[PDB]
From a paper:
In this study, we show that GAS7 plays a critical role in phagocytic cup formation in macrophages. Crystallographic, electron microscopic, biochemical and cellular localization analyses revealed that the GAS7 F-BAR domain possesses unique hydrophilic loops that contribute to two-dimensional sheet formation of GAS7 on flat membranes of phagocytotic cup, indicating that the sheet-like assembly of GAS7 is essential for phagocytosis. In addition to the F-BAR domain, GAS7b possess a WW domain, and GAS7cb and GAS7c possesses a WW and an SH3 domain, while GAS7d contains only the F-BAR domain. The GAS7 F-BAR domain forms a helical-bundle dimer with a shallow concave curvature, which is one of the flattest curvatures amongst the known F-BAR domains.
The asymmetric unit of the F-BAR domain crystal contained two F-BAR dimers. The FFOs had a width of ~14 nm with a ~5 nm distance between adjacent F-BAR dimers, while the F-BAR dimers were ~22 nm in length. The lateral alignment of F-BAR domains in FFO appeared to be similar to the pitch of the GAS7 striations on the monolayered membrane. The FFOs of the F-BAR domain in the crystals appeared to be mediated by two GAS7-specific loops, filament forming loop 1 (FFL1)  (aa 171–197; GAS7cb amino-acid residue numbers) and filament forming loop 2 (FFL2) (aa 206–219), which are located on the convex and concave surfaces, respectively. The positions of the two FFL1s and FFL2s are symmetrical; however, one of the two FFL1s at the convex surface of the dimer interacted with the tip of the adjacent dimer, and one of the two FFL2s at the concave surface of the dimer interacted with a conserved region on the convex surface of the adjacent dimer in the FFO, thus tilting the helix bundle relative to the plane of the FFO. Due to asymmetry, one side of the flat surfaces of the FFO is more positively charged than the other. Thus, we supposed that this surface could be the membrane-binding surface. One of the two FFL2s lacks contacts with the adjacent dimer and protrudes from the FFO surface, suggesting the direct contact of the FFL2 with the membrane.
Numbering used by the authors:
A (entry chain B): 172 to 475
B (entry chain A): 171 to 475
Write the structure that this text describes.
Amino acid sequence: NTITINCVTFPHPDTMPEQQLLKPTEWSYCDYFWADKKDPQGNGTVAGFELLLQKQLKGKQMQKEMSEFIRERIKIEEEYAKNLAKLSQNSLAAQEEGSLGEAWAQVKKSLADEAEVHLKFSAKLHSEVEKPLMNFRENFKKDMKKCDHHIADLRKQLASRYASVEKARKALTERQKDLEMKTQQLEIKLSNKTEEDIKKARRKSTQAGDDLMRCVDLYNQAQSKWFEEMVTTTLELERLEVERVEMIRQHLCQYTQLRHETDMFNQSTVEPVDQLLRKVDPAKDRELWVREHKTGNIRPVDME
Amino acid sequence: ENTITINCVTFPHPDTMPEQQLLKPTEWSYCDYFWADKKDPQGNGTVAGFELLLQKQLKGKQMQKEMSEFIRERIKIEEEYAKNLAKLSQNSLAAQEEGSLGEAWAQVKKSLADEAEVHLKFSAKLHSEVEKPLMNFRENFKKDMKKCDHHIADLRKQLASRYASVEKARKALTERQKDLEMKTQQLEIKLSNKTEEDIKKARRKSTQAGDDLMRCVDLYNQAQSKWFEEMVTTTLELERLEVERVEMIRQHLCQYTQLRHETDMFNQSTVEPVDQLLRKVDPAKDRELWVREHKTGNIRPVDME
């Protein structure tokens, strides 16, 4: 008829009529985690809900690790900027003069500019990617545990109710036996003091049957409460996982855009050097130099 | 005395000053402004203008060397950057993220390696097209100038020698003149028979000394003219060399600029695949992938009995 596994009742075996999915054909949490998972390695049994929770937790661990990756990237960029900046301060070939000297100086200064660009890049990574990836929903900690214990407690109630039901089944079958006995005693010899006990047996028996019906009802109520809770919570988990994926995609797109625009900014720093390289004139340089270093403008002549 | 001699080279006195026009009277050329020696701003020492030109050449070579080394530093930096980027690209952080999100993440990591390739290639091209050409330009120039130095220097030595002779000759002249001018006095006070022949000897040797002077002056002027023409051609050569130096340096710095540009373009192009996969991320499909593998069963509970 039906079957009970871990205090929960399912159809049996069956090739039964029914059953349409709750959300076709999304692979929803609310449709595929009713049975409990028996680990095949022999470490106990857990509700499917536990699988959902572990999946969520793992998701958060993942976004943490991503954040860490970005932190490492930031560190690399800072070292790069550091080196570029120090090299920009280098005094190599500083005594080169003229428009050539100007262009060279501008090359070094351009190095400084690149360094600043990459530093700001790393800062933007920090504010707009690393911290958001990390600091996303810090408060899942005991909250999700709370949810867990909630569902678990509902399962507790279910188990209790099942126990009560089984007890009722015992009492019922027992009383039935007692009545079917005492009616045989009425078949052998009433009497009249024996008879009202035969009536009382019927009383207590039917009473026990009503007790059974009651216990079964309360069981079904417990399972239905557990059911509705299961549904709402699992859908909540589905939504949360989806939006996790969404925010991560968003911030990775952020990373890509920052990379792109940072490389544009970086490329734009050699243009000043280019402007000066075009203005380089060997003749003008030479004349400037001769103007500052001449020994005199008189030519030799013959003696006497 | 209408000329003046400083450091064995003869210039007008000035006067006042004559005039004389420049060889290249619109340019501030090497051939017009480095005949005189530069006076030490303190002592009684001088150095030739030509030496100033030579020193300028040497400085030029030193400077292209230093630029080359600067580029070496840049190469080292880029290489360290590339190394770090490569190692981080190999990191296994969040490797257990699965589905299209996991794949997009994987490409995020790989793009770092791609950047590494770009920057490494950048540094390599810096080495090939910028550093080495700067360093290896005119390798024997150090000695090519040294030889050049000796050339002009040797001429100047000769000039000095000639000048010395001239001065020596003047000594001999002034002496002989006096020797004559003072033997006529001996005849003026106590004339005798040997003194006349001593005046004859004196006059002879005197005119001879004068002829020696004239000759020495001629050879001096000859030496100075040789020094002059050679000086001119050589200074024009150094002018040309400095020009071609500046031009090659400009060329290779432009090369540097080009490498910068294309390196930043290549670098920018590495996030495009990441973008492409990032657009393909689907939460629903991901979920389907996971649930298909982790479902416990799709049968719902029912009522007892």
